[PDB]
Amino acid sequence: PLESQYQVGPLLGSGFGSVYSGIRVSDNLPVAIKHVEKDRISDWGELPNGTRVPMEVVLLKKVSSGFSGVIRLLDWFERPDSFVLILERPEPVQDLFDFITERGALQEELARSFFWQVLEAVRHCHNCGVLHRDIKDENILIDLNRGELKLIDFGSGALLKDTVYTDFDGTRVYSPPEWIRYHRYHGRSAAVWSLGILLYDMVCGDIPFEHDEEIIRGQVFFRQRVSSECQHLIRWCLALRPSDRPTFEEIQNHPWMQDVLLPQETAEIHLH
Numbered sequence: 001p002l003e004s005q006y007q008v009g010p011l012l013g014s015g016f017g018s019v020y021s022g023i024r025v026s027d028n029l030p031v032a033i034k035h036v037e038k039d040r041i042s043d044w045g046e047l048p049n050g051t052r053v054p055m056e057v058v059l060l061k062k063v064s065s066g067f068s069g070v071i072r073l074l075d076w077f078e079r080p081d082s083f084v085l086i087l088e089r090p091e092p093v094q095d096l097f098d099f100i101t102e103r104g105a106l107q108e109e110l111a112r113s114f115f116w117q118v119l120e121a122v123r124h125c126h127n128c129g130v131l132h133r134d135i136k137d138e139n140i141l142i143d144l145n146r147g148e149l150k151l152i153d154f155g156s157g158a159l160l161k162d163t164v165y166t167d168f169d170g171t172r173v174y175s176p177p178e179w180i181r182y183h184r185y186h187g188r189s190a191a192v193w194s195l196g197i198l199l200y201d202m203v204c205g206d207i208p209f210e211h212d213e214e215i216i217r218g219q220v221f222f223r224q225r226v227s228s229e230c231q232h233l234i235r236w237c238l239a240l241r242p243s244d245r246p247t248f249e250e251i252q253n254h255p256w257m258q259d260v261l262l263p264q265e266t267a268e269i270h271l272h
């Protein structure tokens with residue numbers, strides 16, 4: 001059913017897997033086709049109907065209902081040594097790591113719009129019972145035309161829970177001090193930490209911390225001019241003590257978050 005119903009094109013990256021550009025035949029929706037090999041999956045789950053699948057798929061199904069800032073799972077298949085996922089492919093697109101790498105640090109107005117959309121997308125996941133655990137520039141795609149950000153790689157994700165996590169598969173330089181020191185964290189507050197790393201990156205062109213010692217020390221130096229309110233929000237997300245970090249609500253009610261542009265205006269002003 002698979003090679004009949006879609007048409008493969010160029011590789012796009014790897015790997016989280018190996019992803020090819022693809023076209024649905026039924027109608028020419030761009031799609032992306034991700035192959036994941038059974039032998040590299042450390043982490044499995046089960047769907048409603050009760051089949052044994054990779055967590056990624058569990059997590060993607062939970063979040064793919066309706067619209068949002070997540071790239072949606074349109075379908076999937078099993079093969080003898082691999083699973084294969086069919087995902088949306090917006091067109092044209094660029095990931096935030098490449099975008100930042102090309103244009104350097106981002107004007108506050110642009111960072112505010114982007115950051116807001118990441119916030120909405122993460123709220124959506126938490127809502128659906130999903131925690132991403134690897135929120136970073138390269139897991140965000142920009143739809144250059146509509147100005148809409150989309151989250152992508154759920155392969156380190158987990159079901160959201162209130163219990164304390166003991167495993168972590170995401171990026172180190174994005175991991176919170178509680179993980180570095182004690183090998184334990186909670187979802188929401190670890191996510192806020194990483195959101196804080198992300199926001200620094202947006203406005204400074206680079207991440208704040210490289211080594212464990214700098215993460216655990218939690219002192220943030222700004223290498224770029226950044227308003228006083230943005231520094232405050234960033235420092236707040238990057239508090240050492242989990243309980244001293246903001247909730248999403250508080251981040252979203254922060255002064256620096258006010259009067260966010262809509263996506264379309266963001267694209268006009270900053271992407272056209």
Ligand SMILES: O=C1c2c(O)ccc(O)c2C(=O)c2c(O)ccc(O)c21
Pocket residue numbers: 012013016019031032034071087088089090152153154
């Ligand atoms: O690299 C992608 C990806 C992509 O490169 C282009 C369009 C896309 O739609 C995705 C995508 O949905 C995607 C994903 O869900 C997980 C890991 C990934 O590396 C990716």
